[PDB]
Paper text:
Utilizing the observation that [name] binding affinity increases with decreasing pH, we crystallized SeMet-labeled [name] in complex with Kb loaded with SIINFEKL (OVA257–264) at pH 5.55 and determined the structure at 3.0 Å resolution. The structure reveals that [name] binds below the [name] peptide-binding platform, contacting both the HC (α2- and α3-domains) and β2m. Comparison of Kb free and bound by [name] did not indicate any significant changes associated with viral protein engagement. We note that while HCMV US2 also binds [name] below the peptide-binding platform, the [name] footprint is completely distinct and, strikingly, overlaps with that of Tpn, CD8, and NK cell receptors (NKRs). The single domain of [name] (209 aa) is a globular β-sandwich that is stabilized by five disulfide bonds conserved in all T4 poxvirus protein family members. Three of these disulfide bonds appear to stabilize the h4-loop-h5 arrangement used to engage the [name] α2-domain. [name] promiscuously binds [name] through a large, somewhat nonpolar interface divided into three distinct contact regions (α2, α3, and β2m domains). Further, [name] recognizes core structural features of the [name] fold by anchoring each of the three domain interfaces through a buried MC-MC hydrogen bond and two to three MC-SC hydrogen bonds. Further, the presence of [name] His residues opposite negatively charged α3 domain residues (H75-D227, H80-E229) suggests these may be pH-regulated interactions, though only H80-E229 is close enough to form a direct contact (3.5 Å versus 7.3 Å). Though [name] makes contacts to three distinct [name] domains, pH regulation of the complex half-life is critically dependent on [name] His residues that bind to an α3-domain acidic CD loop important for both Tpn and CD8 association.
Residue numbers in the entry:
A (entry chain A): 1 to 277
B (entry chain B): 0 to 99
C (entry chain C): 1 to 8
D (entry chain D): 5 to 190
The structure:
Amino acid sequence: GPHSLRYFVTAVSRPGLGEPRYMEVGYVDDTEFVRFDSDAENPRYEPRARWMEQEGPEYWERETQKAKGNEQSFRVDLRTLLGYYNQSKGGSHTIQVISGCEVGSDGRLLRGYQQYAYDGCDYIALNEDLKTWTAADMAALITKHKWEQAGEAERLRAYLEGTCVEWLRRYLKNGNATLLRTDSPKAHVTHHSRPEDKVTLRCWALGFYPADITLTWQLNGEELIQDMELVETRPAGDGTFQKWASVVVPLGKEQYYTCHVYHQGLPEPLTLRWEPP
Amino acid sequence: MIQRTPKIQVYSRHPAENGKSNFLNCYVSGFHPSDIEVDLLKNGERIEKVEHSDLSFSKDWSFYLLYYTEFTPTEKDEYACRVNHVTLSQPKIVKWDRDM
Amino acid sequence: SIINFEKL
Amino acid sequence: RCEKMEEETWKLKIGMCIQAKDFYSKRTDCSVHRPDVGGGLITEGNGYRVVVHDQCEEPNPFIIATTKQTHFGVTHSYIEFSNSNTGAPENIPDCSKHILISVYCDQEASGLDFHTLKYVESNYLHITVKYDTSCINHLGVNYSFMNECERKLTSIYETDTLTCGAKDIQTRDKYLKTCTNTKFDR
């Protein structure tokens, strides 16, 4: 299947409290493998995956220098946007950047990622053509005009098609054994008499990796989608995830309903019913 | 600019059987800006030692954190989670349900 | 390897 | 790049996910009316009735044209305000771009403890939401306002995460129902 390498940059200002907090978090697919944090005991690039320990000191020195270099650039950009918008210096503002590339099985570049965000609103973003920009507001037009006369779009396309892909290939082969590792969801169905003259069946799914999972309730071979209370997948804290589906069924009809657990770590989708001990 | 109220979930790492040791988690997500205050409550009182995950954000620019601590659940001990954000008029309290 | 960002 | 028509066709979509508190919201049909009382629209459905106004006093075309609603589980209620062609924001009066949305609860007896929060602040749109926190556990707002050209050139960027009780946004939009011009009953 397809894969991607994305870097999540955070830049939050703190007026009268010191220099802005700077963060760089890399993601091979959905897995965090590197992290840099200015507000830490020691501001250096730290591995987040045990398969990144293979890289030598030469690698962790380059990325650190690049991180500090980036932090200074964003420290300026935080002040620069105060001028574009004509805002006050007393307020704390946030810059967020998502940057990376998605490469398919064929090795072909599928997506070029480069989007900026100021205070949660979209600011500027590299289009699919990898040559033009989409400015989300009046102030971004200033940035856009600067990047046109500087040819930033062309310099950026080079990184996306070249550098970013080369490193994705390297990261993938350096940790493919662990990236493929999957934990099977351990499922069970609980029972509660919460509604009046009715009950509630809650199908659980615990200790699974990755977060990709599908839980459905069925009756007469048909899925209950609107009648299904589904909660967001959450972390258990140990590296795995949890999720459950609730459905309100009439009393005495518990056995007529079945839960289904779909996951890539399962040889066969799980089928569960309510069962009293 | 945009602002988003944090989505809160209070849950345990494992199915709660009275007596066995466990972890207590409080998952805050979908909030902006990043500045958020989260503390865990044992019997209405704040737990002194609460560790939190590192800060991150999703594709909608929304931040998400995980606050966790070690604990041992009983029968009459009620746990909860206290979350305050700039988007909240008054701090949010969410009771812990061992089967939720 | 992340990219060397350009100023706004 | 793209055609002349694409650069001039502007579309507006406002998504809003409302989660019930201390009660179960029931799935139902939705209604929509333009009250002669005040400029805007009122919608009844999914245990809530929602009023949407603008800062215009002079009779101007309301920036929202279509309303849709759906329901998932027993807590989530989603509403989608749409407009297939608003035209360029340059040609739209500023007052019509300041939106005030009030969310009241019909199903459960309200405690009348409101909270006003400004969710969106941009050059194109202003979204302020006032809602009763006695019957509402959480409220999220998604906002999208751009032309067909820019939408086509930034489709790789996915900013919508308001699943609102469904597995994904696609499933949410599948069960959407267009609100009609008729009274309510419950």
